[PDB]
Design a protein around this ligand. Structure first.
Ligand SMILES: [Cl-]
Ligand SMILES: [Cl-]
Ligand SMILES: [Cl-]
Lengths: 275, 276
């Protein structure tokens, strides 16, 4: 219980004189006063022993403990006002709002469906340009570590090389934050032409309906202007992590075996670098 | 609209002592897993049918059958709620929330302004990382180059060697090492320092050897204890690069917006040529 609740809870055990002391300490602007026994005594015109008895009636060891604690409450409360600059808060709000917007866009049934497509494919490709090419490389790092045969392609030549060898046991995931990156949209159609399954990640719903096997709507940025937006990868990273978590639970034991084997070779390699 | 738990709660204070014991049972999370037929419930709680019926009528139902029908149907329809997410989904989203919270407590605003000023004052800026940290470096390169910074992203030892050999006192190197021990990054930053460059290490681990660099930025640790369940390794870094970027953009904002917009105009002009 905070100070006011304890004082309030002992108020009616207190004498009229002790209620005057309680009244003083229940004032908001009292925290601004010199709360020594020698100044509170003078201000309230009361004796030093009366303050001690007041603190003990409230369940403290003495006055000094009471007033130090009284200031712990004050200190804890004052630290709850934010200490950050507007600029900082804007950036933090951009992240938290993308979590919230992502959360409201999740279709768990679709994400588990996509997790299954990855598992069912023999070959998985991630297609993306610019900042979305970084997302594609990131996804490969995550999923190769669990044993998936995958590759990340980030230019027309790669998509050309890959789509031309694609078959119906291939799955391509394409990343286009804007939903209109010509090289991504047309490359996914090349892959579809060859028999592959196709997943499009985009922040705009577009006319992709029916065009690809799955279309995943990802968050838009909270900031209107381009120059002030946070990382362009982030809308996609949320969905990479979601699909990943779903995918890991599919035959986890074999996937954990592969991951741990990579880990062991890393430990051994690092030791040899030392020795 | 109102779920059956809310309904029970709202009549709880009207209920008899025995009815309140019945309510307490139905308000428990595990109870939907029991056999909730009146026969089994009466035996379980050692009550009569009538008492169960009286409880259900206190809750505004005609009887227990109506009550339990609703109770169980609300439960089996929760699997259909898109907004009610699984333990896996919540684990991932909490990992992101936890990292935002941890990041927020680690922000040293004076430091990040100091780094943005270093970027502004440098003639050449370099971003070093490998793995996912290399992706953070490539991203930072794109964002700062669009504001006119002369910068490059290096993601392997050959690239570190090419660049450090020609650095001087007007160079700045930002190195990303989430583990705080990546030898190529720590060593390459020390090579850059030997050449007179300023150095900034980003790491989730404040080691003593990090004190050698001009600045060290402490970034967040991950929430999940096991590596295999962690969310993206880029994320601790991305927060701080976005903060630095946001500060840097406000140093001589109009000159930097001119440069960003001039980028934009040059694309449009070539697009007019291509339409011809
Ligand atoms: Cl934003
Ligand atoms: Cl220095
Ligand atoms: Cl995590």
């Amino acid at each position: 219980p905070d100070i006011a609740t304890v004082i309030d809870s002992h108020f009616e055990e207190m004498t009229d004189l002790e209620q005057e002391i309680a009244r003083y300490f229940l004032q908001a602007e009292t925290i601004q006063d010199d709360l020594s026994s020698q100044q509170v005594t003078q201000k309230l015109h009361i004796s030093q022993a009366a303050l001690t008895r007041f603190a003990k009636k409230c369940g403290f060891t003495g006055y000094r403990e009471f007033i130090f604690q009284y200031q712990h409450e004050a200190e804890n409360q004052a630290n709850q006002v934010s200490k950050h600059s507007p600029l900082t808060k804007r950036v933090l709000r951009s992240y938290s709002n993308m979590r919230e917007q992502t959360q409201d866009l999740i279709d768990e049934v679709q994400l588990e469906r996509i997790a299954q497509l990855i598992e069912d494919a023999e070959r998985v490709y991630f297609f993306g340009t610019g900042s979305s090419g970084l997302v594609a490389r990131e996804m490969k790092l995550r999923f190769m570590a669990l044993g998936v045969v995958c590759e990340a392609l980030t230019d027309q030549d790669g998509f050309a090389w890959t789509t031309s060898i694609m078959d119906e046991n291939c799955l391509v995931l394409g990343f286009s934050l804007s939903g209109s990156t010509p090289s991504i949209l047309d490359s996914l159609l090349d892959a579809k032409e060859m028999g592959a399954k196709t997943v499009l990640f985009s922040s705009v719903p577009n006319k992709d309906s029916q065009a690809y096997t799955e279309t995943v709507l990802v968050a838009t940025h909270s900031q209107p202007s381009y120059i002030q937006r946070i990382s362009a990868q982030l809308p996609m990273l949320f969905f990479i992590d979601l699909i990943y978590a779903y995918f890991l639970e599919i035959n986890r034991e074999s996937k954990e075996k592969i991951f741990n084997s990579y880990w062991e070779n890393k430990k051994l390699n690092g030791y040899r670098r030392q020795k």
